[PDB]
Amino acid sequence: GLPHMIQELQNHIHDEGLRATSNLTQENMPTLFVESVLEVHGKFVQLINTVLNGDQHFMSALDKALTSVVNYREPKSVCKAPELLAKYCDNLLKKSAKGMTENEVEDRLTSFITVFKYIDDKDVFQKFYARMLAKRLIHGLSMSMDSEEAMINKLKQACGYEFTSKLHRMYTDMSVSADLNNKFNNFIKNQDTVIDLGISFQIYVLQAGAWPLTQAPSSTFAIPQELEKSVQMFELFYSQHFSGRKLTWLHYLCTGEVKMNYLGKPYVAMVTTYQMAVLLAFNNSETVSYKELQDSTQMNEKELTKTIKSLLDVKMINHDSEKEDIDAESSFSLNMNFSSKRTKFKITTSAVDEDRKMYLQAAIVRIMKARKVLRHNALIQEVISQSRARFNPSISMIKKCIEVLIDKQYIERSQASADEYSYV
Amino acid sequence: KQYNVDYKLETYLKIARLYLEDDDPVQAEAYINRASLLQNESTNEQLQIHYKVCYARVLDYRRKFIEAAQRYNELSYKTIVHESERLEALKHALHCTILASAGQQRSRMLATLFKDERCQQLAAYGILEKMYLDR
Amino acid sequence: KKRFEVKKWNAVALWAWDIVVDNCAICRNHIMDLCIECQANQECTVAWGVCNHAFHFHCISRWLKTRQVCPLDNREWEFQKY
Amino acid sequence: KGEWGFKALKQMIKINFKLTNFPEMMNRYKQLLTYIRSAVTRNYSEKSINSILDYISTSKQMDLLQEFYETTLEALKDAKNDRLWFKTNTKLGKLYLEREEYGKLQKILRQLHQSCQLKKGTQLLEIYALEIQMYTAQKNNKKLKALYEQSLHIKSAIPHPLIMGVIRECGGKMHLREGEFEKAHTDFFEAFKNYDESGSPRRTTCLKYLVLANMLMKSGINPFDSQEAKPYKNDPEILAMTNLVSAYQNNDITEFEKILKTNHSNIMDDPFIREHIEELLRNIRTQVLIKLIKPYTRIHIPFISKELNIDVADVESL
Amino acid sequence: HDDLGDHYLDCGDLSNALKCYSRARDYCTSAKHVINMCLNVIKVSVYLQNWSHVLSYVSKAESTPEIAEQRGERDSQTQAILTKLKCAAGLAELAARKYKQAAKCLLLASFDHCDFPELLSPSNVAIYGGLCALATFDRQELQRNVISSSSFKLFLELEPQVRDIIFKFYESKYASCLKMLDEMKDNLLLDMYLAPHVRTLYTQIRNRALIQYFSPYVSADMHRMAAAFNTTVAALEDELTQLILE
Ligand SMILES: [Zn+2]
Ligand SMILES: [Zn+2]
Ligand SMILES: [Zn+2]
């Protein structure tokens, strides 16, 4: 009776969702997906609120159907939905030129939080959003700090403080970087001896643990000699200001301006430090060899070839013939005759997993039968102590297994306290 | 510069050893604490043996006699080192156990050293056997 | 002064603690030691929190059976990393 | 115009400021402000202006700065006063407190909410921290407690780690005064974490208070065992506190009393440690007494007096 | 009804007031009006010195809103009614020879919400909350409800004598505590709502002190005990004989 119609309407909703989400263009797919799911959810919630005075079971089945459909896993393919939603967030929060007032963005985000709540795989979306927010903050592509703070607050309300723990630290790092720069300027200005850096220095000091950026590459990039005084002075300032910390300069994320003024006044170019070391090495003569760049910039082969290719895209330097492949000559040369047109020239662009999941689920079930009641921390500790024999567990995987067993009616959350589990 | 783990481990062990020869147990322990964080990721067996020897020496210097005795005893079970080095590690373990505070841990260490058949060659086997028998 | 000078440099750097963890706050032994409990009578590893405080797994297990907070920052304890 | 054009205009602004000519300076500044607001998006130009007025403006020019601040405050109320008004208010109002800004804040607060009948957590916490600082300067303990409990209601804010330092330090101080050492410890730890993350002067004051709170809650766990507090363990202003903890934990009366006597004019001078030190030298004495009488079934009171350095009457009272 | 109540308050007639209240009790529509009328009837019952009606109305008021709003809502921000009813209940229980419950339900008062000087002044409120707690509360709950309570600190500094009495009694000091109790007894007897209940309370306090004085001892000197209790050895011996007998 009741379960039969509940099940049949659940399949009806699921098929309606698939039909709505199918036959969509691959270019604007995030926006269409978000809008379609939002309109379906709004229509269904209106239909169930206007009729029969709630009937909680109907929207419970609707939420279950949405949760099942959003985690639509293709054979061997990962769930693309969290990445899609993260890209939608990044596009909404970026500085588009088509209006996009702050109030409308906030309304869109607070409406989007509903479809966000169904992800159930929120760690992939969290990592994607963290990476894209880091890029946006570093490159200054955020249209408003208020919108980013509002989005982080909405995410915190949706899930919790622990979910938005690193993003809060990134936001505070951006907030305090300006104060750090002002204090560094005061420190160099108030020194007993005059300090002339020769460079207008602005830095973004970020938490290593909070930010996804890391010195994962083994690049041996030699520092340019002109801006070594800046790094030495800032290291001294940081040592005098914050005790017990160390600095690891991300040389692949720092940019800067090189000005040409005696070659016909061709305005100023803006390039990364990787693209600046080679230009500085070009000061010896118009033509240089790969050996000279290797000995000067001391960069790895991959990074150096990437820099050379990017320079060729700029047409800053060129090869006379088609001998730019892997060889020993690599006789690059300047192309000053191809002068710039603008001024800014702002260029900026598993079997083991399944085995571990099954082991964790079996361990959780066995422990829950052993105790018949436990707390979250005690359950996690017991699971770790039991499964440490084969592998080191990940807390995210343990929590996912706990959630999937709660859904499977193996264990239940206590009515009095939500952190207590009981075996059923 | 991002040095390799072996270079940092070797430099830390050298600094700890130099501070030990300077009779500076606190700085030796400070620079062995850094080495202990890198010893678990290095693959050099010689580096691990040197770190274990230096850690045992630091613990012995800090008058952590029972811990240094256990470290020396487990270092005397390593087949990589020479026979003389293993015997010296066993002798140091025996000396630290004799110098340790009387208790359950010290009694168990004394029993373990007595069960070893190589403790007879050490010059303190009589003291070891008299302390093992609660005499 | 030069032929192709540099005007501005927007640096990006990551700051981290020189020494993150060197001793469990509960057992007072080093974080790579045997937690003082496994030392006297015996796998001992590190168990981090949401505050990234890195106590011994056994020491924090014994602490959690009496107190629900982190020993250092006195905030609600949540497991992370192992 | 453009970037080079605006930079040239700023150079001319500097040049005209060099030769004073005050009326021209004011009307030029007003026209610049109006043009900037009416044409270009504020955010980036405003942070650039904020960075501009700190490198040259700090050198004396007190009356000119007062006039400029007055004119900016008067001419910025008409459009919006949210970007830089908070920081200039905190900077200028620390010393004077001329009793006027609070009045209009109270008037607008009464006007805004009750008349109409949190999405504003960050600015609410900022104004709460400003009120907390002013009331701390005025020594209003009850108002500080009320402000702390009122700010505790905000759970959707992302503030600067200096606001969260001020309010958490106020909470720790009020918890210390009331006697809740467990809450004071975590409040002071949070305040010190925020102050260390951003700041410098008010950093080795919440660490001392956190040390005192940790020692006042039966101790256990060294405060200088976390990442944040460890580098400042050997700080000249924290050496006394870390020695006090090293003596308190692993209790020994001699070391504690020697550190107290040596730093007679260093630690126990502010009314926060000097008031709470009498609770110490009693908890550590109690722990020493407990450890001493553990293996005994009958013990002489004069023996305990000799061991604890206190006389017979104090031993009996303890 | 409001004018009738005001006239009855300023006139003093109570029988017709009781008749009007009985007639109007059946007409209740809003909880707030019931609250005001319950407070008024509590005041008139206090004036009449009839505590059974006070207890019945207090119990009705507590049991009406789903067992006092279950566990408990956000603490008193501007609703000073709860402190007023707690103070009235404390006065009623104290006047009913029930000191322990009076202290229990009187200690839960706030200075910011005790600004009505028409039922019980802060000075005598602190006096009652100190004396009853000293006489009836054990050491643990006296520590956790008086010395540890920060809200009662304001009341204690309002009347420094009671604060000193409690602090000296708690810290095993009885000569000074009993001397100051005797000194303040004369002022306590001139009071209105405490005097008939003072003497017994005092004896209780003394007895408590006596017991506490022997709590940490297995052999005690009678001379030092008598000196600590401001009495001769013979009187102390008689008092301890009576205490041992019961
Ligand atoms: Zn430990
Ligand atoms: Zn262990
Ligand atoms: Zn913590």
PDB file of C-alpha atoms in Angstrom, chain E residues 53-174:
ATOM      1  CA  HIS E  53      -2.244  29.944  48.691  1.00  0.00           C
ATOM      2  CA  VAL E  54       1.242  31.218  47.810  1.00  0.00           C
ATOM      3  CA  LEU E  55       2.514  27.653  47.424  1.00  0.00           C
ATOM      4  CA  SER E  56      -0.538  26.566  45.422  1.00  0.00           C
ATOM      5  CA  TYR E  57      -0.306  29.501  43.005  1.00  0.00           C
ATOM      6  CA  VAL E  58       3.462  29.064  42.608  1.00  0.00           C
ATOM      7  CA  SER E  59       3.014  25.363  41.836  1.00  0.00           C
ATOM      8  CA  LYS E  60       0.245  26.163  39.344  1.00  0.00           C
ATOM      9  CA  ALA E  61       2.411  28.773  37.611  1.00  0.00           C
ATOM     10  CA  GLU E  62       5.369  26.389  37.370  1.00  0.00           C
ATOM     11  CA  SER E  63       3.308  23.409  36.176  1.00  0.00           C
ATOM     12  CA  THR E  64       1.196  25.294  33.611  1.00  0.00           C
ATOM     13  CA  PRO E  65       3.812  25.779  30.813  1.00  0.00           C
ATOM     14  CA  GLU E  66       4.748  22.141  30.066  1.00  0.00           C
ATOM     15  CA  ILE E  67       6.784  21.574  33.247  1.00  0.00           C
ATOM     16  CA  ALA E  68       8.548  24.961  33.430  1.00  0.00           C
ATOM     17  CA  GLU E  69       9.458  24.942  29.722  1.00  0.00           C
ATOM     18  CA  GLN E  70      11.124  21.517  29.989  1.00  0.00           C
ATOM     19  CA  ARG E  71      14.857  21.691  30.716  1.00  0.00           C
ATOM     20  CA  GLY E  72      15.057  25.481  30.505  1.00  0.00           C
ATOM     21  CA  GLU E  73      15.072  28.312  27.973  1.00  0.00           C
ATOM     22  CA  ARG E  74      17.673  31.056  27.483  1.00  0.00           C
ATOM     23  CA  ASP E  75      18.457  32.643  30.842  1.00  0.00           C
ATOM     24  CA  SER E  76      16.754  35.826  32.004  1.00  0.00           C
ATOM     25  CA  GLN E  77      17.594  38.722  29.680  1.00  0.00           C
ATOM     26  CA  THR E  78      14.863  41.238  30.557  1.00  0.00           C
ATOM     27  CA  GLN E  79      12.140  39.014  32.107  1.00  0.00           C
ATOM     28  CA  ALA E  80      12.474  40.021  35.757  1.00  0.00           C
ATOM     29  CA  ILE E  81       9.233  38.209  36.652  1.00  0.00           C
ATOM     30  CA  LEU E  82      10.980  34.911  37.412  1.00  0.00           C
ATOM     31  CA  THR E  83      13.308  36.511  39.969  1.00  0.00           C
ATOM     32  CA  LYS E  84      10.308  38.215  41.587  1.00  0.00           C
ATOM     33  CA  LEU E  85       8.335  34.980  41.911  1.00  0.00           C
ATOM     34  CA  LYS E  86      11.419  33.122  43.162  1.00  0.00           C
ATOM     35  CA  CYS E  87      11.936  35.807  45.817  1.00  0.00           C
ATOM     36  CA  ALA E  88       8.273  35.620  46.847  1.00  0.00           C
ATOM     37  CA  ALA E  89       8.491  31.824  47.093  1.00  0.00           C
ATOM     38  CA  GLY E  90      11.683  32.144  49.129  1.00  0.00           C
ATOM     39  CA  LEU E  91      10.001  34.516  51.565  1.00  0.00           C
ATOM     40  CA  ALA E  92       7.001  32.182  51.832  1.00  0.00           C
ATOM     41  CA  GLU E  93       9.162  29.105  52.458  1.00  0.00           C
ATOM     42  CA  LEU E  94      11.349  30.940  54.980  1.00  0.00           C
ATOM     43  CA  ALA E  95       8.250  32.102  56.855  1.00  0.00           C
ATOM     44  CA  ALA E  96       6.983  28.490  56.763  1.00  0.00           C
ATOM     45  CA  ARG E  97       9.922  27.150  58.836  1.00  0.00           C
ATOM     46  CA  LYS E  98      11.531  25.687  55.687  1.00  0.00           C
ATOM     47  CA  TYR E  99      14.990  27.250  55.451  1.00  0.00           C
ATOM     48  CA  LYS E 100      16.658  24.848  53.002  1.00  0.00           C
ATOM     49  CA  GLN E 101      14.134  25.295  50.190  1.00  0.00           C
ATOM     50  CA  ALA E 102      14.020  29.041  50.874  1.00  0.00           C
ATOM     51  CA  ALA E 103      17.787  29.232  50.378  1.00  0.00           C
ATOM     52  CA  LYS E 104      17.608  26.979  47.309  1.00  0.00           C
ATOM     53  CA  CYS E 105      14.948  29.087  45.571  1.00  0.00           C
ATOM     54  CA  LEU E 106      16.316  32.430  46.824  1.00  0.00           C
ATOM     55  CA  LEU E 107      19.941  31.998  45.715  1.00  0.00           C
ATOM     56  CA  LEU E 108      18.754  32.017  42.076  1.00  0.00           C
ATOM     57  CA  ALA E 109      18.430  35.798  41.914  1.00  0.00           C
ATOM     58  CA  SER E 110      20.127  38.446  39.782  1.00  0.00           C
ATOM     59  CA  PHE E 111      21.077  41.952  40.886  1.00  0.00           C
ATOM     60  CA  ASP E 112      20.174  43.404  37.480  1.00  0.00           C
ATOM     61  CA  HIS E 113      16.679  41.905  37.887  1.00  0.00           C
ATOM     62  CA  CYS E 114      16.219  42.570  41.618  1.00  0.00           C
ATOM     63  CA  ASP E 115      15.586  46.313  41.252  1.00  0.00           C
ATOM     64  CA  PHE E 116      12.096  46.198  42.786  1.00  0.00           C
ATOM     65  CA  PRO E 117      12.484  47.507  46.377  1.00  0.00           C
ATOM     66  CA  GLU E 118       8.875  46.713  47.310  1.00  0.00           C
ATOM     67  CA  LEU E 119       9.030  42.988  48.199  1.00  0.00           C
ATOM     68  CA  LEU E 120      12.480  42.280  49.677  1.00  0.00           C
ATOM     69  CA  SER E 121      15.448  44.646  49.773  1.00  0.00           C
ATOM     70  CA  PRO E 122      18.856  43.448  48.511  1.00  0.00           C
ATOM     71  CA  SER E 123      20.390  43.758  51.992  1.00  0.00           C
ATOM     72  CA  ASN E 124      17.978  41.406  53.742  1.00  0.00           C
ATOM     73  CA  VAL E 125      17.795  39.180  50.647  1.00  0.00           C
ATOM     74  CA  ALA E 126      21.546  38.650  50.990  1.00  0.00           C
ATOM     75  CA  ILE E 127      21.145  38.237  54.760  1.00  0.00           C
ATOM     76  CA  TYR E 128      18.554  35.480  54.303  1.00  0.00           C
ATOM     77  CA  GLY E 129      20.436  33.749  51.493  1.00  0.00           C
ATOM     78  CA  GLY E 130      23.584  33.693  53.592  1.00  0.00           C
ATOM     79  CA  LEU E 131      22.072  32.667  56.920  1.00  0.00           C
ATOM     80  CA  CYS E 132      19.839  29.903  55.546  1.00  0.00           C
ATOM     81  CA  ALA E 133      22.642  28.515  53.374  1.00  0.00           C
ATOM     82  CA  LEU E 134      25.073  28.542  56.302  1.00  0.00           C
ATOM     83  CA  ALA E 135      22.557  26.815  58.575  1.00  0.00           C
ATOM     84  CA  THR E 136      21.175  24.167  56.202  1.00  0.00           C
ATOM     85  CA  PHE E 137      23.563  23.629  53.277  1.00  0.00           C
ATOM     86  CA  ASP E 138      26.371  21.098  53.518  1.00  0.00           C
ATOM     87  CA  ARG E 139      29.947  22.036  52.656  1.00  0.00           C
ATOM     88  CA  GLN E 140      29.881  20.858  49.033  1.00  0.00           C
ATOM     89  CA  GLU E 141      26.651  22.594  48.022  1.00  0.00           C
ATOM     90  CA  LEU E 142      27.497  25.695  50.066  1.00  0.00           C
ATOM     91  CA  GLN E 143      30.759  25.883  48.113  1.00  0.00           C
ATOM     92  CA  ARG E 144      29.038  25.272  44.775  1.00  0.00           C
ATOM     93  CA  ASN E 145      26.092  27.621  45.445  1.00  0.00           C
ATOM     94  CA  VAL E 146      27.499  30.566  47.436  1.00  0.00           C
ATOM     95  CA  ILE E 147      31.276  30.942  47.157  1.00  0.00           C
ATOM     96  CA  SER E 148      31.463  29.582  43.602  1.00  0.00           C
ATOM     97  CA  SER E 149      28.323  31.449  42.519  1.00  0.00           C
ATOM     98  CA  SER E 150      29.363  34.723  40.887  1.00  0.00           C
ATOM     99  CA  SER E 151      25.818  36.120  40.761  1.00  0.00           C
ATOM    100  CA  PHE E 152      25.531  35.999  44.561  1.00  0.00           C
ATOM    101  CA  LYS E 153      28.871  37.819  44.895  1.00  0.00           C
ATOM    102  CA  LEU E 154      27.134  41.167  44.341  1.00  0.00           C
ATOM    103  CA  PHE E 155      24.629  40.393  47.102  1.00  0.00           C
ATOM    104  CA  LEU E 156      27.495  39.306  49.358  1.00  0.00           C
ATOM    105  CA  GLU E 157      29.435  42.549  48.876  1.00  0.00           C
ATOM    106  CA  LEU E 158      26.190  44.474  49.376  1.00  0.00           C
ATOM    107  CA  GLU E 159      26.134  43.099  52.950  1.00  0.00           C
ATOM    108  CA  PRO E 160      29.814  42.493  53.801  1.00  0.00           C
ATOM    109  CA  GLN E 161      29.033  40.980  57.212  1.00  0.00           C
ATOM    110  CA  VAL E 162      27.260  37.941  55.749  1.00  0.00           C
ATOM    111  CA  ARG E 163      30.005  37.446  53.157  1.00  0.00           C
ATOM    112  CA  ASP E 164      32.660  37.524  55.885  1.00  0.00           C
ATOM    113  CA  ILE E 165      30.588  35.130  58.011  1.00  0.00           C
ATOM    114  CA  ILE E 166      30.266  32.612  55.176  1.00  0.00           C
ATOM    115  CA  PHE E 167      33.920  32.904  54.145  1.00  0.00           C
ATOM    116  CA  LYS E 168      35.171  32.433  57.712  1.00  0.00           C
ATOM    117  CA  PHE E 169      32.820  29.501  58.341  1.00  0.00           C
ATOM    118  CA  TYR E 170      33.946  27.843  55.106  1.00  0.00           C
ATOM    119  CA  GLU E 171      37.651  28.291  55.908  1.00  0.00           C
ATOM    120  CA  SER E 172      37.425  26.530  59.299  1.00  0.00           C
ATOM    121  CA  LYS E 173      37.374  29.804  61.272  1.00  0.00           C
ATOM    122  CA  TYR E 174      34.808  29.813  64.068  1.00  0.00           C
TER     123      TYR E 174
END
